[PDB]
Design a binder for this molecule. Structure first.
Ligand SMILES: [Zn+2]
Lengths: 94, 84, 307
């Protein structure tokens, strides 16, 4: 009796019922067009989604065009991480 | 008095996983026709950074909350009037 | 002028969700129920008196944008946002089943006098369907006269003689355009006054007999307009061309088009509706933020008359 294409689960995901036990769409082809939001997705895929870093990316309105021009002193404003991030951005696709 | 009709047989049967990913696929394709990726990523990033990372919820819960936000955004936009 | 006072008395939330996502509301045929549509396609019936969720149905794969029960409680029309089928007709009498779908029609409504027909809208085209068979009875489209309104909703006049579609006036039994109303906005296509005498397109109020302009009413700009059962008052809530929904609704007098009140609910209004006895006003309210995260949307019930 129920149309299977309009059907939904009866159980809805609830916060207090959904603990973590331990992608969706794609970026623009050229880095230059990225807003700070697309830059944050990019940074998170590299393992650099420290909540402080992405906050600065947003406050300082750092775009994708800007993203190649940066240094570890910027990244301070955890020396080992800054080296990896600097390396990540270097070796990347766009 | 006024009675409310019985639910159809078979309502609620579909699994979360299957429903979630089919939904995410459909709305994402559709949204890309109406929104610029910055907006799309603004909804995705908040949901994942907030529900998945800070509040340590499953990715499925985060995706589910993104789904809810995209639906409402699609709703707003089409009520406003779509050029195409 | 009792439509100057509204007292919030009740609130409805989705009972099984962290965040409510009502997108639509309509009282049931016999007004025992508030029918609330949700942003994922569900329909939910709340008992107005008890306040409890009495039923839940799965209707579409996108947000519900419109709900119209038939006066006889036999049928329900629904519309979605972007998922096909966009509209559908449902049975209401024993089991909830889909009678017919209108795949490409993003808005539907019953004929007014005898509710035996459904008029649907696909862009600039209006379709008229028979309720029993679901067959398309006719297609109203005149390419020459089109205004191309972005929010076009075709609609029957009170007596089902006439159709307003994309700012064009159609005579139903000859199936021919008899007047194009000139275009003064991009979005609102317009509506019949319940008195069957005037047409309200956006700001402009036209006279059907003479096609002379009667009033221009700047307050109505981009407002979704709603008449009370007796045709004495229109409610109005903006949806502009940060959230585009107005934070407030204005009531007017339907005879002289003069303001009566300007009510601020301090929340984004997604939709509103009112019962026939003019006791209650239900308003879908959304928590506006520059913050994407907060999109909790509830239905607040108002008592009209009471401060
Ligand atoms: Zn669009």
């Amino acid at each position: 009796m129920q149309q299977a294409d309009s059907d939904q689960p009866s159980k809805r995901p609830r916060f207090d019922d959904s603990p973590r036990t331990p992608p969706g769409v794609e970026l623009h082809p050229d880095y230059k067009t990225w807003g700070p939001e697309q830059v944050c997705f990019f940074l998170r895929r590299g393992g650099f989604g420290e909540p402080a870093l992405l906050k600065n990316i947003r406050e300082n309105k750092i775009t994708g065009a800007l993203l190649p021009c940066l240094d570890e002193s910027h990244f301070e404003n955890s020396l080992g991480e800054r080296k990896k991030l600097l390396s990540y951005i270097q070796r990347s696709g766009q | 008095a006024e009675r409310a009709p019985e639910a159809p047989e078979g309502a609620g049967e579909v699994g979360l996983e299957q429903w979630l990913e089919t939904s995410l696929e459909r709305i994402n394709r559709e949204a890309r026709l109406h929104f610029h990726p910055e907006f799309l990523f603004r909804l995705w990033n908040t949901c994942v950074e907030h529900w998945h990372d800070r509040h340590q919820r499953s990715l499925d819960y985060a995706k589910y909350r993104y789904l809810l936000l995209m639906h409402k955004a699609m709703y707003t936009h089409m009520q406003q009037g779509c050029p195409c | 002028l009792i439509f100057s006072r509204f007292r919030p008395i009740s609130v409805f939330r989705e009972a099984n969700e962290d965040e409510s996502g009502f997108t639509c509301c309509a009282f049931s045929a016999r007004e025992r129920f508030l029918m609330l549509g949700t942003c994922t396609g569900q329909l939910k019936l709340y008992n107005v008196f008890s306040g409890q969720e009495e039923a839940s149905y799965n209707c579409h794969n996108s947000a519900i944008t419109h709900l119209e029960p038939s006066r006889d409680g036999s049928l329900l029309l629904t519309s979605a946002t972007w998922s096909q089928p966009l509209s559908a007709l449902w049975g209401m009498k024993s089991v909830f089943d889909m009678k017919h779908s209108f795949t490409e029609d993003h808005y539907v409504e019953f004929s007014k006098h005898s509710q035996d027909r459904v008029i649907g809208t696909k862009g600039d085209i209006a379709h008229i369907y028979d309720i029993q068979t679901g067959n398309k009875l006719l297609t109203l489209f005149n390419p020459d006269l089109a205004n191309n309104y972005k929010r076009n909703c075709a609609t029957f006049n009170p007596t089902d003689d006439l159709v307003l579609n994309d700012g064009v006036l159609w005579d139903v039994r000859s199936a021919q355009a008899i007047h194009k109303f000139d275009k003064f906005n991009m979005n609102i296509s317009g509506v019949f006054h319940p008195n069957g005498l005037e047409v309200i397109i956006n700001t402009e109020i036209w006279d059907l007999r003479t096609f002379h302009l009667l009033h221009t009413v700047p307050a109505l700009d981009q407002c979704r307009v709603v008449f009370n059962h007796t045709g004495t008052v229109m409610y109005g809530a903006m949806l502009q061309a940060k959230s585009p929904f107005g934070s407030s609704f204005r009531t007017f007098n339907a005879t002289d088009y003069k303001p009566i009140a300007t009510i601020d609910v301090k929340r984004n209004i997604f939709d509103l509706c009112t019962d026939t006895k003019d006791c209650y006003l239900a308003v879908i309210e959304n928590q506006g933020s520059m913050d994407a995260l907060n999109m909790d949307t509830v239905c607040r019930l108002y008592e009209v008359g009471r401060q």
